[PDB]
Amino acid sequence: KISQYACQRRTTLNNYNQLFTDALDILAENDELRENEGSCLAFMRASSVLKSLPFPITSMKDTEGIPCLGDKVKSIIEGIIEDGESSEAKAVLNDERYKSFKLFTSVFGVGLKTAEKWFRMGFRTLSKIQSDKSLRFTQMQKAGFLYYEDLVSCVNRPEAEAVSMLVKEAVVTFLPDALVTMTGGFRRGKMTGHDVDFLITSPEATEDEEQQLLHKVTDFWKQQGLLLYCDILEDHFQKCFLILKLDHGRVHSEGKGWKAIRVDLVMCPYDRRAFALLGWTGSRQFERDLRRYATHERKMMLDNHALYDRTKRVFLEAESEEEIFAHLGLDYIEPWERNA
């Protein structure tokens, strides 16, 4: 029996139901833009469970016994079986509010509130936004527009590895015992991503040394002329959202000779490294279900910093992700099996 929880399913990148899940992902994204949290969650859970299937749905009979497939979702699956397309997802792709919100929030520094403001002002294109004489932009948005074409092109594995080298070189200069781990999509086996994420931790660094590392690393890059954008502002761990200048010569896999890359660095206390690694590896749906399973099935409270047992009234310690899964009573799910 397929569990309703992503943390009790193995979800690899070989999706046999991309026709269904691409449509369900568009409908979920539209509900997120329209602030319809409930309908968003229903489409996300349905899409997630279909991603775990070891076979493609080819008839409505194939959906029997699958959880998280409500009547609305089954109508969408039925329609795709009928003519290979989703009329509902096609209408979203042609909707002016959906097109505008996707386009505006694709700019680094632009969220739902700014996207909504620009749409209600009558803006539909980034060219008209950028060239407007009355609009005032945040420092994040200015960087978002300046490096737009590089940031909107996907980061591949040779680029991610070239960034990892840069991060490690900088970090070990100030903390030689530091452990630097690539997290996010790339840790789950993905070939591409919109950014590169790293978890940094040090077994011997003091509270002050831990606090100063991201300032030291970014000042070092600022001096080297590689820091294009930097925000050291917050999970509750110290983190930074950056734009780094990646020289093409550093990539072992034409233009200006470099590419702007979105990089996120997270510094955590050594003792919480397993909780942080688990939270930053993802996927988003895998994390949501892990936390929901912990609460509803185990009366435990899980986040990126700790695991608390409400019955035993104790915090549970872990040196690895495997120990967290064991505390929760779950079979271990490998990072490449967390693509829920």
Ligand X SMILES: Nc1ncnc2c1ncn2[C@@H]1O[C@H](COP(=O)(O)CP(=O)(O)OP(=O)(O)O)[C@@H](O)[C@H]1O
Cβ 9 to ligand X shortest distance, Å: 16
DSSP label at 3?
-
Instruction: List the single partner that 305 binds among Na ion, ligand X, Zn ion, none, CB under 5 to 8 Å by kind.
Output: Zn ion
Site residues for Zn ion, window 19-48 (CB under 5 A)? Answer: none
Binding-site member from 197, 287, 289, 321 for Mg ion (CB under 5 A): 197
Sketch the per residue contact string, 279 through 298, with ligand X: x for CB under 6 A, - otherwise. xx-xxx--x-----------
The size of the chain, in residues, is 340
Angle at 225 between CA 221 and CA 227, to 5 degrees: 55
Binding-site member from 29, 195, 210, 321 for ligand X (CB under 6 A): 195
Binding-site member from 109, 144, 184, 279 for Mg ion (CB under 5 A): 184
Q: Does 144 sit near ligand X (CB under 6 A)?
A: no
The neighbour count for residue 311, using CB atoms within 10 Å, is 8
Instruction: Report DSSP letters for 146-179, one per residue.
Output: HTHHHHHSPEEHHHHHHHHHHHHHHHHHH-TT-E
Cβ 294 to ligand X shortest distance, Å: 15
Helix axes 207-224, 157-174, angle to 10 degrees: 120
Count of residues touching Zn ion (by CB under 5 A): 5
**Residue 290 and residue 292: Cα distance in Å, rounded?**
6
Element (H, E) at 265: strand 258-267
Binding-site member from 304, 318, 324, 340 for ligand X (CB under 6 A): 304
CB 20 within 8 A of CB 80: yes
Cβ 283 to ligand X shortest distance, Å: 5
Q: Does 287 sit near Mg ion (CB under 5 A)?
A: no
Residue among 31, 150, 197, 289 flagged as catalytic: 197
Instruction: Report DSSP letters for 279-324, one per residue.
Output: HHH--HHHHHHHHHHHHHHH-EEE-SS-EEETTTTEEPP-SSHHHH
Q: Is 95 a catalytic residue?
A: no
Q: Is 150 a catalytic residue?
A: no
Binding-site member from 76, 184, 214, 273 for ligand X (CB under 6 A): 184
Q: Is 177 a catalytic residue?
A: no
Cβ 131 to Na ion shortest distance, Å: 19
Q: Which residue is nearest to ligand X (CB)?
A: 282
Contacts of residue 202, Cβ cutoff 8 Å, sequence gap at least 6: 175, 177, 178, 179, 209, 210, 213, 270
**17-49 residues labelled b (16+ CB within 10 A) or e (exposed):** bebbbebbbbbbbbbbbeeeeeebbbbbbbbbb
Q: Does 29 sit near ligand X (CB under 6 A)?
A: no
Residue among 264, 271, 303, 309 flagged as catalytic: 264
Cβ 123 to ligand X shortest distance, Å: 25
Interacting residues with ligand X (CB under 6 A): 184-185, 190, 193-195, 197, 235, 279-280, 282-284, 287, 304
Residues designated as active site = 195, 197, 264
